[PDB]
Design a protein around this ligand. Structure first.
Ligand code: A3P
Ligand code: NA
Length: 253
């Protein structure tokens, strides 16, 4: 097709929860648009200073009114220079992002609920008594992440699930929240403005939805498996720096 000049503003809002292929989507969107896509990895690797801003934003998020305008302004500030949002903490703000970027299209990445929970327990939210949690935390300290990072994850999940609090160790609670979240998105977002993606779908329905060519000679990204995060965590602990191992994870980070 012809090359056209794309606007550097949020064009794609992905409501999918963590562990539903958000990092592959992030990579895919950056291949299509040639500008950055927001993701928790963007915070972790490029903008740790955003952590407190997202935390402040979620804090005020219970509140067009005037209180809303201040919040929408900070959302816009955080996302300046990006062409899309994925992953925590953005995903639970999909309703607001749709108001802020009226010309953006909405994606929902879904997958088998037990596969999701299993993946989540290995990476994002291990149980308190799970020994692997201590390894995750140790690898994370190497990246410069502390308890405020875990708090951001916790609070952005509560916010996505619209819960005042959440028993994070409770599998049933999380599964019910997962199903209701995905249901609510499809109920809320007008169908012409929404594409539901399943893992393995690849380029075609995404590119169709976005009116772009499928990228030539480039496979749809398949990164950020829990197996890969286990290897990353272990290598971080082993070498005690990111820059000593960064070359071993070329696409993932
Ligand atoms: N193209 C693809 N096909 C199948 N699974 C994919 C995929 N891209 C990512 N995934 C899976 O999506 C999960 C990561 O999602 P996220 O980036 O949002 O954390 C991982 O699941 P598993 O941990 O079950 O392997 C990963 O394997
Ligand atoms: Na399976």
């Amino acid at each position: 097709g012809a090359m056209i000049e794309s606007s550097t503003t949020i064009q794609v809002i992905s409501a999918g929860l963590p562990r539903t292929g958000t990092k592959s989507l992030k990579n895919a969107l950056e291949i299509i648009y040639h500008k950055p896509c927001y993701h928790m990895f963007e915070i972790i690797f490029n903008k740790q200073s955003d952590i407190i801003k997202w935390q402040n934003l979620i804090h005020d998020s219970h509140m067009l009114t005037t209180k809303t305008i201040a919040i929408y302004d900070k959302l816009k500030e955080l996302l300046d220079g990006y062409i899309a949002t994925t992953d925590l903490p953005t995903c639970g703000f999909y309703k607001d992002l749709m108001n802020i970027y009226p010309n953006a299209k909405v994606l929902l990445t879904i997958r088998d609920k037990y596969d999701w929970l299993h993946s989540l327990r290995k990476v994002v939210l291990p149980k308190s008594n799970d020994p692997w949690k201590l390894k995750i935390e140790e690898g994370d300290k190497v990246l410069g992440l502390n308890s405020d990072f875990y708090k951001l994850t916790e609070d952005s999940l509560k916010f996505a699930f619209q819960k005042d609090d959440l028993n994070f160790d409770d599998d049933q609670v999380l599964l019910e929240c997962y199903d209701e979240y995905n249901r609510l998105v499809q109920e809320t977002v007008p169908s012409d403005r929404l594409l539901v993606l399943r893992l393995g779908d690849g380029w075609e329905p995404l590119c169709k939805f976005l009116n772009v060519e499928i990228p030539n000679g480039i496979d749809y990204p398949c990164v950020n498996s829990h197996h890969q995060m286990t290897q990353l965590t272990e290598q971080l602990i082993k070498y005690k720096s990111l820059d000593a191992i960064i070359h071993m994870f070329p696409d993932l980070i």
